[PDB]
From Swiss-Prot:
Active site (record annotation): H45 (charge relay system), D93 (charge relay system), S188 (charge relay system)
Gene designation per UniProt: CELA1
Organism: Sus scrofa
TM region positions: none
Disulfide links within the chain: C30-C46, C127-C194, C158-C174, C184-C214
SUPFAM superfamilies according to UniProt: Trypsin-like serine proteases
Function, as annotated: Serine proteases that hydrolyze many proteins in addition to elastin.
Protein name, entry field: Chymotrypsin-like elastase family member 1
Source lineage: Eukaryota, Metazoa, Chordata, Craniata, Vertebrata
């Protein structure tokens, strides 16, 4: 996250870290949101490569023990049917990881609340992005979890010519673009948490940023819109 601040350790409990095995070490690649004790929601481009993945919940500092972590392997990866790697502007950037074991829910491991189906936010709605991704465009990952206030840019303003044009679709939520704060690589797959009726709900799955950079005036972070996927999600969880 470019432009944020350290989250408190109990703040975002549904946030998970998605890591892959590199040699005999383990490295952070993406975020995710715990939605069942055995299912994580993440971006599809995160699990494109044929890597061994593991999920860390209740994680806060990547390099130190926090005394709150739970590590569990991924037994099945279910990507949207229509996802195409050569086109992230096409959408369907969402995937479901069933965990090899169920995690224990406590003050650090809680489930993400998803939006009702079809729910669109009013423009400039208060949302926070969270994650361990880059803190500078072309910089390096953060060790502690970062958060940043990112208000939505609605689909009309966002598909207009000064913002994202035709690159963005209505299956996606835009947030930010002040050119100071934003998501960045390592944040993908992670949550966009939007306050709605006194509760925070996970409305976005971080998907992408501009090739120019992460924080760029009028190039908000593009998230996959979760409220467009509730029925697909639920059809997958009730099978496996
Ligand atoms: Ca740790």
């Amino acid at each position: 996250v470019v432009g944020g601040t350290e989250a408190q350790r109990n703040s975002w409990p549904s946030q998970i870290s998605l890591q892959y095995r590199s040699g005999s070490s383990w490295a952070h690649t993406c975020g995710g949101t715990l939605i069942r004790q055995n299912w994580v929601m993440t971006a599809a481009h995160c699990v494109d490569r044929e890597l061994t993945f593991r999920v860390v919940v209740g994680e806060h500092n990547l390099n130190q023990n926090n005394g709150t972590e739970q590590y569990v392997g991924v037994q099945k990866i279910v990507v949207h049917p229509y996802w195409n790697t050569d086109d992230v502007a096409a959408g369907y950037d969402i995937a479901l990881l069933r965990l090899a074991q169920s995690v224990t829910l406590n003050s650090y491991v809680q489930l993400g609340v998803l939006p009702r189906a079809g729910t669109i936010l009013a423009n400039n709605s208060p949302c926070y992005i969270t994650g361990w991704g880059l803190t500078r465009t072309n910089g390096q990952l953060a060790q502690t979890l970062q958060q940043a206030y990112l208000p939505t840019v609605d689909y009309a303003i966002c598909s207009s010519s000064s913002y994202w044009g035709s690159t963005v679709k209505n299956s996606m939520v835009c947030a930010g673009g002040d050119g100071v704060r934003s998501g960045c690589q390592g944040d993908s797959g992670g949550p966009l948490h939007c306050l709605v009726n006194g509760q925070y709900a996970v409305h976005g799955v971080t998907s992408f940023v501009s090739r120019l950079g992460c924080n760029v005036t009028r190039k908000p972070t593009v998230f996959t819109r979760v409220s467009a996927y509730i029925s697909w999600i639920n059809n997958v969880i009730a099978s496996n």
